[PDB]
Design an enzyme around this catalytic site. Structure first.
Site, PDB file in Angstrom:
ATOM      1  N   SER A 154      52.418  14.770 -32.701  1.00 55.41           N
ATOM      2  CA  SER A 154      51.569  15.927 -33.036  1.00 55.41           C
ATOM      3  C   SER A 154      51.854  16.335 -34.477  1.00 55.41           C
ATOM      4  O   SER A 154      51.653  15.506 -35.382  1.00 55.41           O
ATOM      5  CB  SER A 154      51.767  17.016 -31.981  1.00 55.41           C
ATOM      6  OG  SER A 154      50.778  18.035 -32.133  1.00 55.41           O
ATOM      7  N   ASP A 260      42.422  14.395 -25.597  1.00 57.69           N
ATOM      8  CA  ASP A 260      42.900  15.225 -26.704  1.00 57.69           C
ATOM      9  C   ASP A 260      41.709  15.594 -27.588  1.00 57.69           C
ATOM     10  O   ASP A 260      41.021  14.689 -28.074  1.00 57.69           O
ATOM     11  CB  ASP A 260      43.927  14.425 -27.509  1.00 57.69           C
ATOM     12  CG  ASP A 260      44.633  15.229 -28.583  1.00 57.69           C
ATOM     13  OD1 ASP A 260      44.183  16.339 -28.956  1.00 57.69           O
ATOM     14  OD2 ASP A 260      45.670  14.706 -29.066  1.00 57.69           O
ATOM     15  N   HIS A 290      46.606  16.014 -25.046  1.00 62.11           N
ATOM     16  CA  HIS A 290      47.461  16.055 -26.220  1.00 62.11           C
ATOM     17  C   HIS A 290      48.921  16.165 -25.811  1.00 62.11           C
ATOM     18  O   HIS A 290      49.293  17.041 -25.019  1.00 62.11           O
ATOM     19  CB  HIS A 290      47.099  17.248 -27.083  1.00 62.11           C
ATOM     20  CG  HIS A 290      47.847  17.304 -28.379  1.00 62.11           C
ATOM     21  ND1 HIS A 290      47.597  16.431 -29.414  1.00 62.11           N
ATOM     22  CD2 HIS A 290      48.863  18.102 -28.792  1.00 62.11           C
ATOM     23  CE1 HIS A 290      48.427  16.688 -30.413  1.00 62.11           C
ATOM     24  NE2 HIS A 290      49.200  17.702 -30.062  1.00 62.11           N
TER      25      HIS A 290
END
Length: 314
Positions: A154, A260, A290
């Site tokens: 991320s 995501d 995600h």
């Protein structure tokens, strides 16, 4: 559908530009340098920069205590939250070390809005400078300096990408480190206009656009919007450093989950890299939200097996 992004993030706005984070939801855990059957890796903490109060955690497979690839891992959290010693990231990095059979270097980085981008990138770059000159016994005895991979989840994957871009003009000074690849695990990228997948997945309960808007607002430099290259690598024609990444044969692995909201931009970044001559290994999975493998340990093994194959492939 997430109505209140600040409450979702457990943060409050503060009258000096800062935020107050409720840390109680993400407990931290200490390093464990002595081997234990309960611990997939041994770990220890080392300082990096006193002025910045930055440090890092080293991880070594229990068995190591035949040099191992160096995986530099940057944790996630939208550039505004989370730390190296969060149990969630500590346990993940320990299993990375074990299942890749790698020495994992997990550097801390300063958080926004207190330290807006590019502060995190500067810290990510400084961590490589630290490895290059470390006298630490685990580094000296177990780290293969010829096999360095920059990894992140991320925001950490965005960070790793940008450390790669910043290292390309610096490759001489990186020696005796040699970077071989970047491993981008659901990297945090966004644009101004909603992408196709941000619209489709607008009601995501993990990282919906109403939440990422907040995170970019707090972490991007004052005055810029989401079509800045920090958040959106595809603006214009991408960095003029990608062709050089390709010429040096640094491989890039782009890992994405199809549930995501970031996926459309993540796939388009992979396309741009390939068009610039970068060798890109793409790893996309239907039904993954995600950070899927962070939140669900039963998804980690096949991810780690694909990463191990990637690392061996150089």
């Amino acid at each position: 559908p997430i109505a209140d992004p600040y409450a979702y993030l457990n943060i409050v706005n503060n009258p000096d530009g800062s935020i107050t984070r409720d840390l109680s939801n993400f407990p931290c855990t200490a390093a464990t340098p002595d081997p234990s059957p309960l611990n997939p890796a041994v770990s220890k903490d080392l300082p990096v920069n006193q002025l910045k109060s930055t440090w890092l955690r080293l991880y070594l497979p229990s068995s190591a205590v035949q040099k191992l690839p160096i995986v530099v891992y940057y944790h996630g959290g939208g550039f505004i939250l989370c730390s190296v010693d969060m149990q969630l990231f500590h346990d993940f990095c320990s299993e990375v070390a074990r299942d890749l059979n790698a020495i994992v270097v997990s550097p801390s980085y300063r958080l926004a809005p207190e330290h807006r981008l590019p502060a995190a990138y500067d810290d990510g770059v400084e961590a490589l400078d630290w490895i290059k000159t470390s006298d630490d016994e685990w580094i000296k005895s177990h780290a293969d300096f010829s096999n360095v991979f920059l990894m992140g989840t991320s925001a950490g994957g965005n960070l790793a990408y940008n450390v790669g871009l910043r290292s390309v003009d610096s490759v001489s000074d990186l020696s005796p480190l040699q970077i071989r690849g970047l491993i981008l695990h659901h990297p945090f990228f966004g644009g101004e206009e909603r992408s196709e997948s941000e619209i489709r997945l607008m009601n995501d309960q993990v990282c919906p656009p109403i939440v990422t808007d907040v995170m970019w607002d707090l972490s991007l430099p004052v005055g810029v919007d989401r079509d800045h290259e920090y958040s959106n690598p595809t603006v214009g024609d991408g960095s003029e450093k990608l062709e050089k990444i390709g010429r040096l044969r640094w491989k890039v692995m782009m890992i994405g989950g199809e549930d995501d909201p970031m996926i459309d931009l993540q796939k388009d970044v992979a396309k741009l890299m390939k068009k610039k001559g970068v060798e890109v290994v793409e790893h996309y999975t239907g039904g993954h939200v995600h950070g899927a493998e962070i939140r669900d340990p039963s998804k980690r093994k096949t991810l780690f097996l694909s990463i191990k194959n990637f690392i061996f492939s150089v």
